[PDB]
């Protein structure tokens, strides 16, 4: 179809900053942006529909460069146990939900006044598995504990089901590639992409999309299921599956083919991020490097012989240097998700390698630990956005579900930065970024970031993904946007 | 860009004949078809290109719905040995022929007064494989059959270097998955889209796509290199490969996993095709079938279960038989390809199975010798165009490099039938077809039998794939078009 969006305030780019009041748009691509009265005309001419806008404001669509389609889908639909405050509630709440396996997470014994058990679980008559809080325990009871089919470790208590460490890790993975079927990844990328659409989120790069989440993606992309643009980076399991045939990089119609997904360390909270001196809250470590520079280099060189891009997760600044240093050797500009911590002589080499940064806002919000971890010291090195926006190409992402998902709530994140919330505003205070700089991050910024090269702006030859507002989004208060 | 061609006579459809005066492109799309002035107008507007054509006129290009784009690049490049009239002018042929390895076809003991031998090709310093004329027979040097390392059997003459029956079959394999690589794939298949591009073939169905020619179709789509629409037909072994990923259908910028490719028979040629009673010059056999229902359906019901077209090789009216079964149990309306013996009984059928069908007219013209294959008795089965267009979507190919890529000379041959070429026209006169129903089945009855929903019209919404002509092609003796 040819329409026009006429009679409205149609942001098309946000650095610079250019606004029109009529849009072309031609099977899902803009043609015009100008004046409302020839884009009328146009469509007049042509024949086909001519949306009035009615005053409303028109802008591109928020673009998250970095979240788990599947993992927000599943999260969607498990059951919530933080804030039971007994064996008796949880039990209760875990009997209201529905599905085959009843999956939950956000329990805490200090809030239950004791741990959950295997036998208590059994009181379910379906396989259970809850997370605690934070996510690195789970309790499971016997049905579940039968399809797991773990290994007996010290990590894993098989009377009170009690599931941690490396036996997490293998429950997790077993979880993902054996007991969910391709038919329950269907079903939770369909409810997360329609969750995300509703917030105006219309495209997405999907990290760590394993074997059987391609194979949703797949089967959605054939049927015309697919509602938002994906670009899959996918685990090196994949990778190499994908090398067999010889699929490199492959844009359809909503999936797009576009990279692998490599890590260098952990995370702050568990101090598993690799930093170069000790943690500030615990001198007796300094983090846990997750692979090595030969492996991440090998995988990387079998990325791009398929024309691949890279994206290598790098949270403390050691695994920064490691991940700086992959991109160097393999003379390939790529990307590096979280940059959690850089340092002054870091951003120069950033500059140099020309390399993608996505980064994740609400994360200020949610780490309130992170002075601790990292010292006064060291502050300045945190979530540095607005220094590392000077130096590359910067997206935002939400790292979805992880943090919420609503944008504006990253969006506040990056323009006010805890300001009443955490301790790091009055620390970081300089690194606030306008509305304007963060909405370029969300959407062309994040586009740029995923290589999306026809997606981020409502300029001609775009793809026409756009969101209507009510109101000017520069001029409304971020947590305050309707429907 | 968006361009407007303006000025000339442009035909959007052959049936029904529907012509205007402009177009106007948008990426690649036809938006408007109309009014000169009007399309003009429109890119006035919007800014853009406006081409004057001068009142020259434009057709939808054609679509070639069946050919072997890696074996016409080999082709191209192959020695042409036919004619040649003794071992000394064969061997000089040779000596010209550019590459690692020597590929020549055509040649005939009957013009050369002997067979060439392995011994005598010794005198070419590299790997030489040569053809006889009708490709059953080969023969090789020392170099090549090292490479070849060919199972002994009495089909392997290693003295005198002769490859026959299953022998060359195991040749066949040997060169097309282990002699050549993906980088020779790479340069055959630029070869051929730039000479089918040079025809006005602008979309083609690949047939029976094996690994390494996946391999390099990704690459070249990737790389932007693709010039043509490339609909992938794989190989039974391929389709498990894209099994093993979840790959099914998959619509790119150019190249498309469209299906798999199967075969019920052989030729006539051969007395392979099979018959429902034996061969009218060769009592004794009834033909040749390649693989059983069975099978067939399971291969089937894997491509279905992906979203994948099938096709199937059905020359014999045994054979169509045996295709139709498949079709009717699967409860897939799938494409055949060839349908040379179609009995009247076998139309209703097609009918009802609402099956698509890829043929190729210019086998008319090589195909001298089928009225001795099937008697009088069967004629009116042969090549029966006219009543095939009545029963289904009717797709015209060349199945090059078998019969020349030139899409003039096939038109030739459905409207024209080999008059004064071939005895089958003084039997057969009645299925002639008009040259309107023949570009229709070349361009938009081909695009359909390929299922490319966008592709064979010049109407909005359509792929703007079009070429541009001195005169009305309609109109034009097919042997006489230019440039």
């Not at 014994?109 to 379910?124: F, H, S």
């Not at 054939?222 to 599956?241: C, H, M, Q, W």
């Not at 990292?374 to 130096?391: P, S």
């Not at 190409?393 to 504006?408: K, Q, V």
Request: hydrophobic content about 40%; proline content about 3%; overall charge negative.
């Amino acid at each position: 179809s040819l329409k026009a969006l006429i009679n409205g305030t149609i942001y098309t780019s946000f650095n610079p900053l250019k606004k029109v009041s009529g849009l072309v748009i031609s099977h899902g691509k803009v043609i015009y942006a100008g004046d409302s009265e020839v884009a009328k005309k146009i469509v007049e001419l042509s024949g086909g529909e001519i949306v009035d806008l009615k005053g409303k404001y028109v802008m591109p669509a928020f673009f998250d460069s970095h979240l788990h389609l599947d993992e927000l889908g599943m999260s969607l639909e498990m059951v919530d146990l933080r804030g039971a405050k007994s064996i008796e509630e949880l039990i209760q709440r875990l009997k209201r939900g529905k599905g085959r396996i009843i999956f939950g997470f956000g329990w805490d014994q200090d809030e239950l006044g004791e741990w959950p058990t295997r036998k208590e679980l059994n009181a379910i008559d379906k396989p259970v598995f809850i997370y605690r809080k934070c996510f690195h325990v789970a309790v499971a009871n016997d049905k579940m504990l039968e399809l797991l089919n773990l290994t007996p470790s010290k990590d894993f208590d098989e009377d009170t089901g009690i599931i941690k460490e490396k036996s997490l890790e293998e429950a997790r993975k077993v979880i993902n590639e054996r007991v969910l079927t391709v038919e329950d990844y269907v079903y939770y990328i369909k409810r997360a992409q329609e969750h995300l659409l509703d917030l105006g989120v219309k495209s997405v790069s999907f990290m760590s999309v394993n074997e059987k989440a391609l194979r949703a993606l797949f089967y959605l992309e054939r049927e015309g299921k697919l509602s938002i643009n994906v670009f899959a980076y996918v685990t090196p399991e994949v990778l190499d599956k994908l090398e067999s045939i010889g699929l490199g990089r492959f844009q359809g119609n909503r999936l797009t083919i576009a990279g692998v997904k490599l890590f260098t360390d952990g995370s702050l909270g568990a101090r598993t991020a690799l930093l170069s001196k000790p943690y500030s809250d615990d001198p007796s470590t300094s983090g846990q490097l997750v692979m090595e520079r030969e492996e991440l280099i090998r995988i990387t060189e079998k990325a791009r012989s398929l024309g691949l891009d890279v994206a290598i997760h790098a949270i403390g600044d050691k695994a920064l240097d490691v991940a700086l240093d992959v991109f160097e050797t393999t003379g390939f500009p790529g990307r590096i998700e979280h940059a959690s911590l850089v340092r002054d002589d870091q951003l120069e080499r950033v500059k140099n390698l020309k390399v993608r940064l996505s980064v994740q806002p609400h994360f200020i919000i949610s780490d309130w630990w992170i002075v601790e971890r990292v010292g006064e010291e060291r502050v300045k090195w945190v979530y540095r956005f607005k220094d590392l926006m000077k130096v590359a190409e910067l997206g935002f992402s939400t790292d979805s579900p992880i943090e919420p998902a609503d944008p504006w709530l990253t969006v506040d994140a990056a323009v006010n930065r805890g300001k009443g919330k955490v301790k790091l505003y009055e620390l970081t205070k300089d690194q606030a970024l306008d509305i304007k700089d963060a909405l370029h991050s969300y959407t062309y910024g994040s586009a740029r970031v995923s290589l999306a090269s026809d997606i981020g702006k409502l300029e001609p030859g775009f793809k026409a993904e756009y969101i209507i507002l009510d109101r000017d989004p520069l001029v409304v208060k971020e947590g305050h946007h309707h429907h």
